[PDB]
Amino acid sequence: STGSATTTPIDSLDDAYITPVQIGTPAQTLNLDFDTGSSDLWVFSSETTASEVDGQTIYTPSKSTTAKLLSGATWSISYGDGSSSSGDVYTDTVSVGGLTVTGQAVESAKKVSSSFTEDSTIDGLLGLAFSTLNTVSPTQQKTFFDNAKASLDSPVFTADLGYHAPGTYNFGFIDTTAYTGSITYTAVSTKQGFWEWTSTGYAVGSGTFKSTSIDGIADTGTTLLYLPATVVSAYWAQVSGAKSSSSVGGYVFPCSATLPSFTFGVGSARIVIPGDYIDFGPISTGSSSCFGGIQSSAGIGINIFGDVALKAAFVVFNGATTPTLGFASK
């Protein structure tokens, strides 16, 4: 089997991407944030504290003839950005772009933190990291991909995120028309439950490539590119007027600037992030100071190849016995 679904930016800045997901019988379609950095499929629901729902579409398990309460199961997750959610668990039928999994754990939110409430466009998350990170207790549950894997034509999914445009998540096949050149595969460590890999270096603009190992995770659920302070300083030094602002919480730059590209290495291959991808617009409405899309990972504990990096590539998440990651230009 295979599946293919379009993923769409939630706003003009590509702050996140949403993908429609069918849950239950008859289908209830929710728009979920596919997140290769976490492993829970959770949704706003009829059980979510009323004051914490503001415009989201909800899953109502009582209206699904295939929903079954998973007895005694609860979940609770805290994300790297400080947001969180928790609740109980159903199993139900879940379909993505024509690919169907029966008995998928659907984690129904009873509580969500303010950032989720305040974002009306995201109805929940679909985690695509390794199932070892799943938070369901006392019996850990499998991700949608893990459940689907055996049925897939090939045990892979691909992320093809657009810049200010829709893109695609495919399951079970590689669309050879979706990228240019070849896909370069690179080793993955699953020790932390992430798609963790090691970039071979970077360049800023037309500058010379610096060969250096940068360990980080491929994370579709993180907006920006978080890299070591040395690398980030080298990038912003090429932008007149750019500065790290403690009050704003990262590097900012004059909105009148033209940003240089940023290149990262995948083996001997190179992925070029155009400068425009690194512009996240005014820090506050009407300001002429803009927020940078490349930020320091220093206070995170891990480097994160988030959407800023991933949307410059066609990315293969290879879930073979020994997982690997593939990157192609596009």
Curated annotation (Swiss-Prot):
One of its GO terms (biological process) is proteolysis. Disulfide bonds join C255-C290. One of its GO terms (molecular function) is aspartic-type endopeptidase activity. It catalyses: Hydrolysis of proteins with specificity similar to that of pepsin A, prefers hydrophobic residues at P1 and P1', but does not cleave 14-Ala-|-Leu-15 in the B chain of insulin or Z-Glu-Tyr. Clots milk. Its EC number is 3.4.23.22. Keywords: Aspartyl protease, Disulfide bond, Hydrolase, Protease, Signal, Zymogen. It comes from the Eukaryota. Residues 17-328 form the Peptidase A1 domain. Belongs to the peptidase A1 family. The chain holds residues 90 to 419 of 419 of the full protein. The active site is at D35, S199. This is Endothiapepsin.
